[PDB]
Amino acid sequence: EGREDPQLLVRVRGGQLRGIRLKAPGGPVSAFLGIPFAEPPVGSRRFMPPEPKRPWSGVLDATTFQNVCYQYVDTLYPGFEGTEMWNPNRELSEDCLYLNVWTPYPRPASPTPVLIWIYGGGFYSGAASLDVYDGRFLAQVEGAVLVSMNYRVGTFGFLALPGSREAPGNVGLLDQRLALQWVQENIAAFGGDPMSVTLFGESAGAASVGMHILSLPSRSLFHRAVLQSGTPNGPWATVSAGEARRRATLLARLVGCNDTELIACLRTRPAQDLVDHEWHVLPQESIFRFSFVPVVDGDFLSDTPEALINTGDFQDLQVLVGVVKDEGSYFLVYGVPGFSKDNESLISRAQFLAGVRIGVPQASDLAAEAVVLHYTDWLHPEDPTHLRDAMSAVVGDHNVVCPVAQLAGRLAAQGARVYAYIFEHRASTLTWPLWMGVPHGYEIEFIFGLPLDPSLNYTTEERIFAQRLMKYWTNFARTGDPNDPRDSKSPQWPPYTTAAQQYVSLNLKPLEVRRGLRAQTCAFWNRFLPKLLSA
Amino acid sequence: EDPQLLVRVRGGQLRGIRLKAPGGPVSAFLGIPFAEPPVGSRRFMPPEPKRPWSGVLDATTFQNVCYQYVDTLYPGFEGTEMWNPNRELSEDCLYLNVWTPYPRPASPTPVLIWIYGGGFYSGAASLDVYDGRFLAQVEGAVLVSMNYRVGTFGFLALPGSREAPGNVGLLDQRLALQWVQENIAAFGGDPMSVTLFGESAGAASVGMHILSLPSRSLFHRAVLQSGTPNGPWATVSAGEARRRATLLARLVGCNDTELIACLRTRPAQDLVDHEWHVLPQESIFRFSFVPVVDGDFLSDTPEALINTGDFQDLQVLVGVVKDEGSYFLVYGVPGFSKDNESLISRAQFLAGVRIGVPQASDLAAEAVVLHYTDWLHPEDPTHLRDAMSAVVGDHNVVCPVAQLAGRLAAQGARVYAYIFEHRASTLTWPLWMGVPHGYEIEFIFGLPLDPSLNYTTEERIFAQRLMKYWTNFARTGDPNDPRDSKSPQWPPYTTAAQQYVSLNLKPLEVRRGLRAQTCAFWNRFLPKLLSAT
């Protein structure tokens, strides 16, 4: 010590940390980046549950983000900001179980509500070190404590041979849980209140927030939750034991390999060799489907999410759920022929047809037909513009919008307090074409408050708007209610009830209350197709 | 002896009667026989042309109404009784009526032939709603309406038999059509300008005269009001017709020849008493004795026939009313009455869906309930009531109409589509029924012009507009008065634009898509569902 900033030195259960004084446009913030919460899950620890980090000697430097968990990298659009912004911005390693903490400068006097971020990226990608997950603005402007872990993704996080000792699966969710316990024990040394922990995540992250709600051991580690454009219930967020087993055995073949002697060979494999064959175990040509995701194992998940969300009691739970306007436009350029970010993606009815078999890969021709019939505009059934807008709406409604409404309805029926939003504002900074509208994950840069960075060239309204959202999110984190108690003049935001089904619009304009979250089109997806597909 | 009231036709001489319409006199020739009485051994048999008569025949009254079931539901209620027979029931039905202006036209005048409805089980040309005097007096029209055998007597079939070949009720129409070809000039009618127009079962009949080649020499234009040849209720198969006939015989106490034989030895009411008991499921908007795919009158199913036809010189006028389903709910669906408000449960809604669509499997019924439920208020008994009515109207009329209007246009026909959205100020049914099946008719025929009917002064003007549309269509195959402007114009229905107009007190409003989404569900999806399973 001696000559160092005395306000950036903190001790946690593993040892001492030297953090860093970061600059935010309105003032300084404290950051602790690269704090290990687990033993490096490498060698014989690959595919295994995480063990707590062995305490270190001396002071650990916590000024830089640590390694990103081994994952697939986007090669579709090289150097294109709209894709690279999600790409790994640190070195790739199986040694990746580190978490980051943001705090005001100096650190808070009173115990301060905690915000824990879980990134998305369909369980195959993501990192807490990305610019869009920068907790410096929430900590500066809202005075919040913000933690964000790294969890194992893809093969390393979710490959399972259910019932085995050497690959029980779901271990990426275990990484997340260990970080939640870490917060319970250590967050006080930063001014964090471990009795006011709010989870929030997006896509796969939102999904896992859901899974912590549905998993008992995790239910002690938080008090409120936010699910942004993702759910534990649905088509992509889970697989069966048999199906997970199938994808694991198949992968072993593709790379050269009794579950023991099988996994033993897998551990002798280079990490890239597993990444390079990951997409090959999908049973159908699909989009919005990911190879290695949470498995229903009768442990972390006692039953299916749908089962659990139907039976379970959520009397004293507060949830904030919501979706963006165009949840599906993003995925179309990654699989559906006719689609690209460089043209207007005007498609034929024949291409709309093929796309439905891709967006809904688990559909018999009859169910597929039903989808085509529902989404067709029989006044203009050949209009390329409408077909395009409907292709994205299929993918959007099927994977996010309807599972969310399904979830927002069950929770709200079984005791939970539920607030719901639609995010409708297209960033002026968006690098995607206009036809994609408000794509998947583009509310994130507004929750974290990036428009506050003057170098980013946003607008004054986008600034205020970003400010307003951070209020909603933080107010919800401490109160369980996004509404400000002082300000009663401005519009209110009612809970989503089964009765009225109210939700709010999130745009540059004041709150607008709307009833019914794609009510008709979702009763299609949520009530009918499961019955149809039963035969 | 008024020489205007004296006509000579191929069978002899007729004396009409000079009738009083509020704007002038008309000539009426009522009770003219076009066929030998289909009695005794002529039951279930094709009609024969009427043998000539001596002296001057008295054509001043409506003849008897073809023998049929008579409604017992609401005795004395003028909304049910207005469809009930106003003459005496007899198997001596085969007579027709003719209205012309007075004096008769000096020039060959286009003919309108009304084919009544009533589910192929009832109906008569003598009803006051079918009073063809106003169209003749005001538009200068030659108007014809025939009787045709209904129910068992017109449609009981034992396919392949010589003595119960089926579709005879349709052949009665065909004969009255040939009659007009032969004798209409005598009254002043242009037999080269003949327009068929009918409602419900009659619109279906009209549709089959389009689909049957021998009939195609008998007219040039058609109008289908709230009914189609295609659909769930308008035809049966040979197997099913044979089934119902064989069953009815069992019910009344009766080889083909030896079965139709014993049937002829039965009083009419003994057949009517068991008419409904042959329906396979508890249904509504389903009729026991209707036209049948015989391979003769109907070479194939109407669907298979409309899918392959060439209508490159046909001109059609099709349409529906607002609430094509309200009428049929009080006749079976629990919870429904015209005396309360029929706010219903949800189990009640599912119960009715099973009855309105008795053809549906468990899954297809579910599909119906899911589609029609308003998930914002999925237990609102007011919406559930309105939806039960909509399931029935769309399944049985609206979507079939849309299906047909599309195929005709696609295959060369010139089709005009409407929807009747006005509810009469004199309507005696409850409000929740809105504009029920058959309530465009009072207005097409011009009943408002009868001052005793207490219609409003705007309903009077509205009727005159429709009469103009219908007659203009008959004269030209185009509903548009070639003297107007701006309104705008009633445009042809196309497979592309799917344009149609609405008929109410306000001027013409052009709309696009006739339940386009809801019908794709009916026309395209539900078959494939059951077609699979």
Ligand SMILES: CCN(CC)CCNS(=O)(=O)Cc1ccc(Cl)cc1
């Ligand atoms: C959570 C953030 N997302 C949404 C923008 C970032 C991108 N990744 S994604 O999983 O959403 C879509 C995807 C899928 C398969 C392939 Cl090969 C590539 C991309």
Ligand SMILES: CCN(CC)CCNS(=O)(=O)Cc1ccc(Cl)cc1
């Ligand atoms: C001119 C055609 N209609 C339209 C109102 C007159 C009578 N109505 S109807 O016969 O069509 C319907 C019906 C069905 C079954 C029974 Cl038991 C009673 C009525």
Ligand SMILES: *[C@@H]1O[C@H](CO)[C@@H](O)[C@H](O)[C@H]1NC(C)=O
């Ligand atoms: C858009 O891009 C894709 C990929 O190149 C291509 O398949 C499609 O033909 C393009 N559409 C247009 C309108 O050029």
Ligand SMILES: *[C@@H]1O[C@H](CO)[C@@H](O)[C@H](O)[C@H]1NC(C)=O
């Ligand atoms: C906005 O500021 C200027 C505009 O020319 C530019 O140099 C800078 O790169 C822009 N910022 C971004 C990243 O859009």
Ligand SMILES: *[C@@H]1O[C@H](CO)[C@@H](O)[C@H](O)[C@H]1NC(C)=O
């Ligand atoms: C409507 O009438 C039916 C038949 O009488 C009856 O069962 C029902 O109670 C009535 N519905 C009401 C009162 O809303």
